[PDB]
Target: Xylosidase
Amino acid sequence: MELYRDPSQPIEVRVRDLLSRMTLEEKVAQLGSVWGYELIDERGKFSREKAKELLKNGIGQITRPGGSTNLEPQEAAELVNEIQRFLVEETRLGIPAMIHEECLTGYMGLGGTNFPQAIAMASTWDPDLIEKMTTAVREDMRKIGAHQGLAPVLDVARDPRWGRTEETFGESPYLVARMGVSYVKGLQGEDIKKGVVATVKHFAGYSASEGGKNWAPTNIPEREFKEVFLFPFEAAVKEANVLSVMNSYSEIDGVPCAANRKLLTDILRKDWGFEGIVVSNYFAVKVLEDYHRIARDKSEAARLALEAGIDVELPKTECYQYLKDLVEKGIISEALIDEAVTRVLRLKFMLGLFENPYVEVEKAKIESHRDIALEIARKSIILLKNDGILPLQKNKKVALIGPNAGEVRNLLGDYMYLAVLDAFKEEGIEFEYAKGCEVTGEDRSGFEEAIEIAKKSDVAIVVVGDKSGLTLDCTTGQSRDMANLKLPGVQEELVLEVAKTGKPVVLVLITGRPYSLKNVVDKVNAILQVWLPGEAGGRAIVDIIYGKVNPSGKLPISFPRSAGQIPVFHYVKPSGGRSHWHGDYVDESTKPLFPFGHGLSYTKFEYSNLRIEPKEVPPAGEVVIKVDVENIGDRDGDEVVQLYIGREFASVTRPVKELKGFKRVSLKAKEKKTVVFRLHMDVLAYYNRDMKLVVEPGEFKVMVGSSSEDIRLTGSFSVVGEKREVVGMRKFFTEACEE
Amino acid sequence: MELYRDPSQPIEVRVRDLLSRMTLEEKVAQLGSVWGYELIDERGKFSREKAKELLKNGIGQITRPGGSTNLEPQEAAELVNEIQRFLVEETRLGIPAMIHEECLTGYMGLGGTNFPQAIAMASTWDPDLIEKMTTAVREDMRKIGAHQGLAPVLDVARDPRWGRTEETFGESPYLVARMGVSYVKGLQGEDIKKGVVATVKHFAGYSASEGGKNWAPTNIPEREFKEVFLFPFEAAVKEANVLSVMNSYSEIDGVPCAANRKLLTDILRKDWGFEGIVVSNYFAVKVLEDYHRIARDKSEAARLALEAGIDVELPKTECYQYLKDLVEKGIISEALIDEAVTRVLRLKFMLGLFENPYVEVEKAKIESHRDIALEIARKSIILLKNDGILPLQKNKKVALIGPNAGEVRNLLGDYMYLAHIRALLDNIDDVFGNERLKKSIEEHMKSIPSVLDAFKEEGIEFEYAKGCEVTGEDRSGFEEAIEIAKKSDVAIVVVGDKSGLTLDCTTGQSRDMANLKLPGVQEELVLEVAKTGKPVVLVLITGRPYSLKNVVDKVNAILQVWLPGEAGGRAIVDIIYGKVNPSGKLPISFPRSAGQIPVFHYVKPSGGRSHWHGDYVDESTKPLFPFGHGLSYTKFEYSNLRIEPKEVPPAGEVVIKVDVENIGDRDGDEVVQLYIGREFASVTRPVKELKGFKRVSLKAKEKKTVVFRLHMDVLAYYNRDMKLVVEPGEFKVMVGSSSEDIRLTGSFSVVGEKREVVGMRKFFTEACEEAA
Amino acid sequence: MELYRDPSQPIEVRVRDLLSRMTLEEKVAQLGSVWGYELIDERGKFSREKAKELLKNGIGQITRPGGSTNLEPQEAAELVNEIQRFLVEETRLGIPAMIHEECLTGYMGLGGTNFPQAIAMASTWDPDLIEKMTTAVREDMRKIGAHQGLAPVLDVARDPRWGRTEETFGESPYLVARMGVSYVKGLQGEDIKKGVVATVKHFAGYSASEGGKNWAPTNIPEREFKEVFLFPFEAAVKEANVLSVMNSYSEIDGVPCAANRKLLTDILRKDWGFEGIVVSNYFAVKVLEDYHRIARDKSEAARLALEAGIDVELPKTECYQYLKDLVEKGIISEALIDEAVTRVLRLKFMLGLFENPYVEVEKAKIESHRDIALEIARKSIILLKNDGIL
Ligand SMILES: O[C@@H]1[C@@H](O)[C@H](O[C@@H]2CO[C@@H](O[C@@H]3CO[C@@H](O[C@@H]4CO[C@@H](O)[C@H](O)[C@H]4O)[C@H](O)[C@H]3O)[C@H](O)[C@H]2O)OC[C@H]1O
Ligand SMILES: O[C@@H]1[C@@H](O)[C@H](O[C@@H]2CO[C@@H](O[C@@H]3CO[C@@H](O[C@@H]4CO[C@@H](O)[C@H](O)[C@H]4O)[C@H](O)[C@H]3O)[C@H](O)[C@H]2O)OC[C@H]1O
Ligand SMILES: O[C@@H]1[C@@H](O)[C@H](O[C@@H]2CO[C@@H](O[C@@H]3CO[C@@H](O)[C@H](O)[C@H]3O)[C@H](O)[C@H]2O)OC[C@H]1O
Model:
């Protein structure tokens, strides 16, 4: 048999052999894609007639054979098998396709579990739980013959105007990077032939658009770019061996990311050693022409993207077919096509597709992971405020009010395929329900009814927030940016009208972004933040309200007092986070309403006995930080212990405090444990005036606490010795354990 | 005589001779400063006792001998002469001091005219008028023996939260640069021995702090930095030969500007050829330690600042005395001190101070420039909205309402002497441990014409109700205002800021406004007055854009009056009654709301919108009023666009002509604006960006031709490799009455090979008028 | 009077005023040159007929009015006075010429002392003696109305194959730099109105050609370049305030020095703060075309050299006349011409030429400096070996 067909040969040999056999047209075909829906008839069955046109010379990827066809799992699996058989048996070289789906919150297609949104995942501060989640997602995807998931989002969000905030892991490069590595590891596993390719997106800076506006310029200078925005992707590449990256739609400082070789090649491939495929953001090649206006035609767009280092044009071939013409006309070298094709073929071999591209349809029934979803929902909800009203007693009469109290659709996030009162009923609570108002618009005609049921109750539970998705009726999600951060519609007014009854008020926010709570916070008795929880949402909320679950989520993003305060974030430099010299704005504190890492409990945790050893370490040494934490209250609960590091008198300015470690710790009432952080000096490296990564001698401040503001214990150690340039591989994360 | 004393020798010879004679201590002394107030006794007279300690080895500068002493001009001149005589006659080498003052809106001291704020200056779009202004300021300053004015501000402002917005020339690097060059040219003149050193500030990026917060990081990437923030300073250095620069307090991306040699030396001196002195922002050296936490002590702060390229520590020696110790301990080379001292001595020779450091006290009486101030105020006020109510008829009974109708203090900006000095009053009042001044302030304040006075002089029948204060939540004055409105024909509601440095101020340095709502309950006052159903003219006397989304549709006309200083009242009333036809144009976009920030006219194709619904969920992405906006009591008709030639090579020139006719019934000035757009460059470019303008006077029914000469140098931008280029392709020409009100469009092409623009290149379009 | 004519005005004011009055043609003329021998008749006297063609719009420099004419000193002084009177009185703006001569081993013309070669100068290890020498050369040159001497050579020589070894101060960047500073200081003095502009050459690397062959590539890596070859020029610029630099004919690693903005502008002007004029090596602009083959015609050669930072084309205008055409055709900006013209006019003001461009012919008799020459010769000879015979 030909070498490329022989599984006893090393992949490099098979790749070289195959490439040597391919025509230019066949090469270019491997750099494009076709939609699943383009390959089916009106009953969702594979159409050989359509495949003969679209797959004649092979194809790089099939886009969303499940997500774009609305097929149930077994039918999607059958479609994918039929596509693969056509490629294997009815093309000249028989190269199989790679299949991709969205999977951020689970496989985005019929029959898959709708897990809580990414910002909820982050709020758990539980990396192992997220790895468990994506290990499940991996098996769901493989059942239908899907090889690649377009997740996770490693965009670092400090601008909650942006509609895609919900898809991020929040403001902290450390927490984003750590959750990202766990996410990737679960999807891919050790041998990708048994796993699913992860796709970190949107490389890079995409969460920092001008004015929080989708696709607008992300004008970030170099040190900030490296330390905040690139860092999570760097960790995914080097620690998690991520096998795909997708680019940002935005320009950075005049250069669209899809046309930026310095970004997609020089940083990603040359500096960091990425060996997988870069897939375009959907239509990102064409919009080099249409939107950014730097390419005069589809040929030029193709050339810019290929030179930049985009290997596969998604979601359908549009500009990359003109790569054939560009070679034939002597405008680009076929060697550059070969480089891209090599990357794509290698990954196809690594996935095992040339040995077996088929799945067993009888096994393609996707299993529910409602259990994992509920664990995330229960650990993600954040208790922002509680004057003692919560937990409630079951014998209290509840007035359940608001648009998000009754509305299952509004529990869903923007990449859940299908984009509470029931939970109260199941728990056996006596309540009356009033919608109060819609999520959007100005209609106040439901206020009187809500007020009247409040007046007759013991406690009003007001459930407000977003509708997430991509259409105009949505208040958050991709393309739905909110300038002024007010709760949508007249929901704020509803809360305040209910509060005016004098009844106790529990405010439940079911939202995708931070909202300004400045006008309600001091008028309500407790506040729960419930990031869009998907199919597990209702149960977790009621579990928390009644104390069956002790809330344990912590904010992964700061809650601004107002939009005019943006940005607020915990790791400001000494000059950040204040106005000099009066501290505050004329009209507003410079402090966020709720800080990063904030989250209360129905119990109290007491921290003691900080140990830092040794007190002096050299610039590639390690310190071990220990604290004791005791649950001194009356309820079992989890605490997320947080490690912040500060530095002064470096050669550049540094954060006053910045997250460098954390551990979720379970404590029974009156239980005490020791939490241990092992901190390698590599983890503290920062860029100096010359853009070198260094550790400089001096003092580092250690701050351990329950939030970025609720610091319990402080101390310090010193780095002693000559400045160190940190070269080559280095540690990214602290290790945490319990003793 | 020693060579340095001999005026027949070239300055370089005199400098080298002097430097060769100086001790290390004497050298370090030239890099520092003393406050004016440290050199006077209780009667405001020079104190030899204090001078013996502070000036014994000479000094670089005296900080604000007028501005910090509350001396009248002849007394300040006497002080300065006595300081110079002490230096000339009672120090070993007899080196005279340079004196600096604030002068942004005029010499900031007693007796100086209070001109309108810088943002008002920009709103005139009249560079020559600003040059006339600073030529007058030059003469005022020289009368008191001042050599350097700490102006202008070339910070480009796109974030109106920032309290220093009023000190800027707005959002456009083009307009800021062009106004800055005129400003500098007027202060300095041709021969600096007869002029005043200008000080461009705050180098660079200082108007782009995180969240609009004073001193917070200004994290700007390189092409934006060069094209937006550096550009006005580049023009000031290369076209206007500016002789001083002051640094930004902020860090850029981890590096404090006061410690950044890449900025204060490599860009400013090496790349651009700046030959003057860099003066520290006040206390900027020390706060490398105290604020940024990158210097461990005062010695290290001094070293970082000197290495970066700061020549003089202001406002008083604090860290730079330790440069002596650093040399003596072999930590720094004396050669690096010599480089700084050389710059300072050269400028002192160039100012003529070694030939004559004295002024004639009998001539030190500063003249009023109310005339120039009034021309600026009259050309600066912007008509943002007018449904036809303006101009008003003089027979209409007016209800004059609001805090800014009745308080002269609130006409003043943050670097006008009687506003700025309030901070000192606070600090004196805060002394709880171990007079004539508060009286001289009040009496000088009383001299300033009021808005009330202006209405009275114009002969209008009106009643006045304060309505509310600038700050706080007290609505107990609303009822009175509402009642006088109900009894009137028209309510003129005058609201806005109190500008300054203290907590009771709403704008100015250190007073940043997050949410851009009119201060206090002033918005509510406007809306309550409107609810009477009477016609409402809203007059904003402010230092920044405010959100007007909640009032714009509820009022009949809106006038923006950037803090106008002493000419304010007359100009406002002149405009309201049509004695002056408003002609100001916005130099900065007015956001709909704070959450929309930033909004600016020169967005890239992906800027200024949210894709793919265009708007935010809750808000338009368009500003409420765009850059260049400003209405008139007449109408201007644009015709006959000519663009020649249609194809030009990469260092060629195109000539753009338009005819503009005043087709209305009142004489008026129009500011004709030229915008250029470009696509299919190798980098993204603004869809439209200002590249030229001309204020043109037109009588009723008069037509003139406006001509723009546009060299391709002016269009240069930075490519992917950070080279300044002109690339072949098509440029769109858009000429109109604002950045949105484009009247005529066309295009020309650049033909030939891509050009790297090297060395000196043109910065500005030339604009003139011809007979139509 | 016009500001540029007024000696009470600062030079910067005079420069800006003059530049503002000049046509493009007059500007370009200040960036070129004419040979002395092109301006004389068969009897060695100034020719008004020849001047009317060659000087009609003014000129940057006259090349070697003594060195190229075989005139005795008083006759060369007369020639130079007649050239200057023509420029001052019979051109529109009356800008005087700068005159240059060779002077490495003394004024290179009849009547000047022949001092020992530069390598002999270095062999004295006596910087003050060399400063005494060039102080004398200064007075010789000023007597004939010469303003600039094309010396010293600061090329550091480690390859004795090269025929220009004798013109260098040898192999040591330290000794070359120290001798160079003294050389420059003697020629220029404190106030250049009373001195002669020195011209450090050949910037830079020119003594390190492939195989020791004249004009061949000088392929020197960056640290060596900075520490060995640039260092003496750096010292001349920063310590000695040298007012002219002349470029190397060679390429460095693919880039001819006459076309290298990174060298003649970014290092020399931006990094080091040089404020004088860069004068081309003779014919160096044209040979960007003829020899290096990187310019397709004289226009392109002119553009490359001007962009690189050459202010004056020597020894005669050849390519730089096309700078007029390049501006008129919109290929280069007139601002770039203005930058060069500014440098040239500033130096002409600093030399006092607008106050007095003439010399007294009765004083133009150059004195012998055999005494100084003998001290150098006596201190320069090296005893390499002596078994006792001497
Ligand atoms: O109320 C009291 C507070 O004021 C005081 O805090 C200090 C207030 O003054 C602050 O220093 C300021 C810093 O900014 C300087 O402005 C520059 C001056 O020169 C201008 O040309 C330039 O444009 C400006 O940027 C200003 O001169 C100086 O006074 C100081 O940092 C504060 O700490 O604390 C005590 C309270 O009672
Ligand atoms: O025998 C005849 C050959 O000479 C002739 O070839 C030309 C000879 O002259 C060459 O031009 C030289 C190039 O070097 C110049 O020297 C510089 C002058 O200024 C000094 O300050 C600087 O130090 C020197 O480097 C010299 O002036 C000039 O004459 C030319 O390139 C040759 O092609 O061909 C005809 C034969 O018959
Ligand atoms: O994370 C990836 C997303 O960034 C990506 O989203 C695409 C965004 O563009 C959408 O196209 C718009 C649809 O509406 C029209 O009116 C607009 O003109 C279009 O630009 C497209 O539908 C999205 O797929 O999708 C892939 C994700 O992994």
User: Anything to note?
Assistant: Chain A touches chain B through 76 residues (CB under 8 Å). The radius of gyration of chain A is 26 Å. Residues A 102, 150, 201, 281-283; B 612 surround ligand 3 (CB under 6 Å).
